[PDB]
């Protein structure tokens, strides 16, 4: 990792992150065979089997009722991202719901537990059968429940049953609680055997396959499930796994803290509002403004392209000489000098103005330094902690190359506009000069 | 559904949603009889019953310690909505907590598992007994645990016990984790049988009853539960189900994307900030600014009136010639032209400006059209997908009548104010002329 302190604006840009960006969805359609359960009835009295059976049949009968429905940039982007995801998933479920497609899916899963299927709407879904409960119900439990008597002396039957239905009951809980669209792929929607098997079937390059098989917790975390329905005594649902059609491109993260100067004792503060993740995608700079969008694993940042807003390629001029590019770098400005620490990956920005006493120290030595007034950049090599008054921040002990891009801060070199002095999320030349 | 594309402001209004709005709360006071448990002790050694018994008794002894304590409109509304809900529930629990009330509630539940009761503070709560664990502990386990030495050879007893207490332990987990006020009604607080029974007891019109019995997943999701306490060996808690005292009134949702236009190659943009759900309530237009407030099923949008902000009946003039209405229609405006897709219910708004390549395509045909730059409205019949550079958005395949309300966009027809050019959430006539 690399990190430039941009002295001109009290903001770091951290570079050398690689990219993984979701660009499509892969559909795995699971036929969980609940089995013959609605032909078994305990009728003798209270019993272990009756209780598990009633739960299983009650859950199944419940599930039949469950169904799905068949500028401040952050709020915009994360609005679109979720709307796009559900619409992409629902559009496929709405093909699979057709009885011609379910019966095709079910039929190709007759003698194999895994099938590749092409829907009439052309999507080449994978299909999977889960039968562990059906096999138990058909071979064991149907033979045990003689003539509706079921308080049998075999407790191994009843304890066994409470294991096999456990997955089914968990699937019902998750779809019913979420009204048919789960936010993430639980171990009960897709076990880790099936995720690895589904990943290995994706129509993707082996680089993505290896990367996905390593980061499979992220693949699980980005995907989501939709309930198709209950058909016969199979619940049918589907899991939209991500396809990471962009990888290995540059990304960087911009952090900022308030830059201020006491012009005649009045703090002309400025803060960059264009903070957050940026990536190059296919020859376009893409900005991911919402904090849910992107997550790191080492150098890899896992973003969603549906959350990205394209920004002009000139926008990196805001990281080189924001003072003097004509691109409209977004800032806030105003009178009040907030003093704060912004923890970057390889260090901390420390905004420290009149009032608070800021210091940096190491566990070996205590206070190493009292920081000057004004924004300072503390590499994670300079100290182990920063303090702001009595508040102590532990710094991220991480190897990387820090840099300083020197320059007199804008706040200290341009004059603030007399009125309005406080302006939120404006192009910089509206605050200064 | 209907969807008028308002050309002059790059915003759709989608219409013909009907309304369901929570306007009160209905209380069910559950009495979960934990049973005689603290008169039973297992003292011989490790055993199955002892472990379940110890969990049950430890959970009960834990639960006795758990107790409850008793403009950018979005952040306001969702502040008020939560505060109102909790205060309305707490105010009822503070009646039920009186021993003179608990003992009345408990007494009417002596002969029946369901009782209707009027608290001394006048609220006509329903009361319910949950009693299966008491019956087990009294009839089975007390007889089996005998003179201590509960390590009996009967394992049906131990496995049975781990089933009956499971609800109780889940109620303890949920109230303890949430410090006495759960955010939603789990199956453990209120089973489907109890919810359907409670709905059928509500003092409401039959239309609401049928609607609530169909949408009982929503009733469960809008309600919440409060722990009253532990009285003797009964845990007593209450579930606040919603009352939907306004239904079937008109609602609409306004969506917008940046309406930019270029003057001497400088962009000028506005964005409508009055986005989100609106409804007519009792002859008042009411605005629901926070995205948690409202949820759709079919045509019905389930909002909460505590979240609604009343807006003047003239405010619908922001949907028809906002260019000349005297109402202060809230917009943002500024230089930077975001290019984005806003997915409406019956289509997509596609803001597409200098830079990104925008196209629309069908799964059967590929690219149908390269979109013109400028805001475009794409009905879900014109195409199956919209792309913004490499990004692809699948459109909602939903039938409804799209409309276009034509007009030259405001930003194409008024000059921006020279300074401040960037203004956030302002009355439109501060941006232009």
């Amino acid at each position, epitope marked *: 990792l690399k990190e430039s302190y941009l002295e001109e604006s009290c903001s770091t840009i951290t570079e050398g992150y690689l990219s993984v960006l979701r*660009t499509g969805w892969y559909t795995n359609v699971f036929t969980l065979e609940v089995g013959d359960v609605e032909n078994l009835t305990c009728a003798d009295g209270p019993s272990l089997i009756k209780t598990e059976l009633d739960l299983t049949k009650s859950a199944l009968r419940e599930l039949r009722t469950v169904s799905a429905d068949q500028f401040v940039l952050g709020a915009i982007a994360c609005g679109v991202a979720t709307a796009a995801a559900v619409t992409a998933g629902v559009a496929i479920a709405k093909c699979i719901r057709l009885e011609s497609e379910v019966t095709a899916i079910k039929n190709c899963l007759k003698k194999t537990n895994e099938c590749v299927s092409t829907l009439g709407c052309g*999507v080449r879904v994978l299909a999977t059968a889960v039968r562990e409960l059906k096999d138990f119900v058909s071979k064991n439990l149907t033979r045990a429940i003689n003539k509706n008597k079921c308080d049998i002396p075999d407790l191994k039957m009843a304890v066994s049953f409470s294991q096999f239905n456990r997955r089914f009951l968990n699937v019902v809980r998750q779809f019913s609680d979420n009204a048919g669209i789960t936010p993430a792929i639980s171990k009960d929607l897709m076990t880790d055997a099936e995720l690895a098997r589904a990943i290995s079937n994706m*129509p993707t390059s082996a680089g993505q396959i290896k990367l996905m098989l390593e980061n499979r917790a992220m693949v699980r975390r980005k995907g989501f499930g939709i309930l198709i329905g209950v058909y016969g005594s199979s619940v049918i649902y589907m899991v939209q796994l991500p396809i990471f059609g962009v990888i*290995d*491109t540059p990304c960087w993260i911009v952090k900022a803290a308030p830059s201020c100067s006491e012009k005649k004792g009045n703090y002309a503060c400025l803060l960059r509002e264009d903070q957050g993740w940026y990536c190059q995608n296919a020859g376009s700079t893409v900005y991911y403004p919402c904090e849910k969008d992107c997550e790191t694993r080492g150098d890899h940042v896992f973003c969603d392209t549906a959350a990205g807003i394209n920004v002009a390629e000139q926008s990196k001029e805001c990281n080189i000489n924001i003072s003097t590019t004509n691109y409209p770098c977004k800032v806030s400005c105003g009178r009040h000098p907030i003093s704060m620490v912004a923890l970057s990956p390889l260090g901390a920005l420390v905004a420290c103005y009149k009032g608070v006493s800021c210091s940096i120290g190491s566990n070996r030595v205590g206070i190493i330094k009292q920081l000057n007034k004004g924004c300072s950049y503390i590499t994670n090599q300079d100290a182990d902690t920063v303090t702001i008054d009595n508040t102590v921040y532990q710094l991220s002990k991480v190897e990387g190359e820090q840099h300083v891009i020197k320059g007199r801060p804008v706040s200290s070199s341009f004059d603030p506009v007399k009125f309005p002095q406080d302006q939120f999320n404006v192009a910089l030349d509206q605050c200064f000069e | 559904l209907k969807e008028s594309y308002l050309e002059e402001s790059c915003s759709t209004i989608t219409e013909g949603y009907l309304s369901v709005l929570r306007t009160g709360w209905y209380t069910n006071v559950f009495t979960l009889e934990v049973g005689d448990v603290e008169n039973l002790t297992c003292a011989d050694g490790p055993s199955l019953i002892k472990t379940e018994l110890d969990l049950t008794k430890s959970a009960l002894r834990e639960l006795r310690t758990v107790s409850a304590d008793q403009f950018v409109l979005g952040a306001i509304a969702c502040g008020v909505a939560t505060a109102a809900a909790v205060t309305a529930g707490v105010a009822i629990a503070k009646c039920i907590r009186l021993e003179s009330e608990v003992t009345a509630i408990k007494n009417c539940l002596k002969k029946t598992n369901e009782c209707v009761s009027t608290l001394g503070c006048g609220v006509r709560v329903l009361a319910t007994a949950v009693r299966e664990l008491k019956d087990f502990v009294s009839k089975n386990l007390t007889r089996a645990i005998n003179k201590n030495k509960c390590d009996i050879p009967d394992l049906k007893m131990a496995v049975s016990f781990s089933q009956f207490n499971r609800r109780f332990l889940n109620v303890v987990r949920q109230f303890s984790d949430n410090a006495g006020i759960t955010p939603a009604i789990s199956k453990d607080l209120m089973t489907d049988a109890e919810l359907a029974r409670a709905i059928s007891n509500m003092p409401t019109s039959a239309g609401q009853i049928k609607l609530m019995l169909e949408n009982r997943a929503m009733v469960r999701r809008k309600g919440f539960g409060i722990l009253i306490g532990v009285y003797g060996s009964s845990v007593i808690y209450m579930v606040q189900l919603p009352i939907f005292g306004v239904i079937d009134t008109p609602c609409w949702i306004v969506k917008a994307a940046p309406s930019c236009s270029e003057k001497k190659g400088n962009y000028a943009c506005l964005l409508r900030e009055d986005q989100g759900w609106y409804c007519q309530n009792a002859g008042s237009t009411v605005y629901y600014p926070c995205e948690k407030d409202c949820e759709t099923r079919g045509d019905h949008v389930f909002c909460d009136t505590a979240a609604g902000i009343n807006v003047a009946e003239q405010s619908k003039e922001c949907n028809i010639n906002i260019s000349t209405t005297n109402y202060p229609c809230k917009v943002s405006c500024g230089r930077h032209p975001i290019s984005m897709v806003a997915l409406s219910p019956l289509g997509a708004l596609v803001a597409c400006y200098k830079g990104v390549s925008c196209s629309i395509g069908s799964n059967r045909v590929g690219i149908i059209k390269q979109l013109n730059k400028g805001c475009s409205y794409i009905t879900n019949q014109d195409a199956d997908t919209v792309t913004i550079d490499n990004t692809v958005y699948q459109l909602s395949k939903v039938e409804g009548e799209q409309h276009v309300i034509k007009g030259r966009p405001v930003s194409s027809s008024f000059d921006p104010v020279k300074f401040p050019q960037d203004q956030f959430n302002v009355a439109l006539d501060q941006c232009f002329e």
Partner: antibody, heavy 124, light 107 residues
């Protein structure tokens, strides 16, 4: 203009080595996967090798494995193919191609911009 | 291997259709199909990507589809400028990028 320009192609005796170079210009070269493709004279296109947008992944055809080595300098905006043990059957025009993909359905890349290619002759 | 007919021909204004028959490791594995035109003495030109999307600056009379393990390019309104090789392309789960044997059109 967005242009790729191959260079370094020439005549090599079998068993010799060669290093093709493809200078890229007019585009954000560090954003794109880059590829080498070849065409034996009058034969079809053969994909040779590929490199990811910042060199973390490299792929080779079975004819190219071990014999070739693709690399890129994102600062020089230059794509290279080192070649060794050149057989007579390696006589071909080599094109570099910018490669691009949409992840929506599947990740299969396609070669949107091609260089005009450089003739490599492998003979006595 | 991805296979195409060695040549096709027609009079001007005919439709000609070029098949690209792949297998369960490539086109049948879900990978999409792309088509390239190569006029004599030039680098290939992308005609089609992702089965049927057409670049800017490709005549609307080129049209294509994918179905099963196969694809086809229909050159409607065949014209003197189409006197070129046409290569399909896909990706193979084992071989990675596979071009077809390439079909010459003759007007």
């Amino acid at each position: 203009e967005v242009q790729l320009v191959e260079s370094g192609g020439g005549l090599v005796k079998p068993g010799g080595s060669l290093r093709l170079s493809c200078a890229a210009s007019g585009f954000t070269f560090s954003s794109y996967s880059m590829n080498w493709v070849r065409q034996a004279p009058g034969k079809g296109l053969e994909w040779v090798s590929s490199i990811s947008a910042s060199s973390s992944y490299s792929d080779y055809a079975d004819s190219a494995k071990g014999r070739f080595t693709i690399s890129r300098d994102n600062a020089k905006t230059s794509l290279f193919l080192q070649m060794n043990s050149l057989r007579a059957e390696d006589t071909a025009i080599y094109f570099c191609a910018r490669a691009r993909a949409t992840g929506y359905s599947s990740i299969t890349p396609y070669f949107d911009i091609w260089g005009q290619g450089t003739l490599v002759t492998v003979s006595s | 291997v991805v296979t195409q007919p060695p040549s096709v021909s027609g009079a001007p204004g005919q439709r000609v259709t070029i098949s690209c028959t792949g297998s369960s490791s490539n086109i049948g594995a879900g990978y999409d199909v792309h088509w390239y035109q190569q006029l004599p003495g030039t680098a290939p030109k992308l005609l089609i990507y992702d089965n049927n999307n057409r670049p800017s600056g490709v005549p609307d009379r080129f049209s294509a589809s994918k179905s099963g393990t196969s694809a086809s390019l229909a050159i409607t309104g065949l014209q003197a400028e189409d006197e070129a090789d046409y290569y399909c392309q896909s990706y193979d789960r084992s071989l990675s990028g596979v071009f077809g044997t390439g079909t010459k059109v003759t007007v």
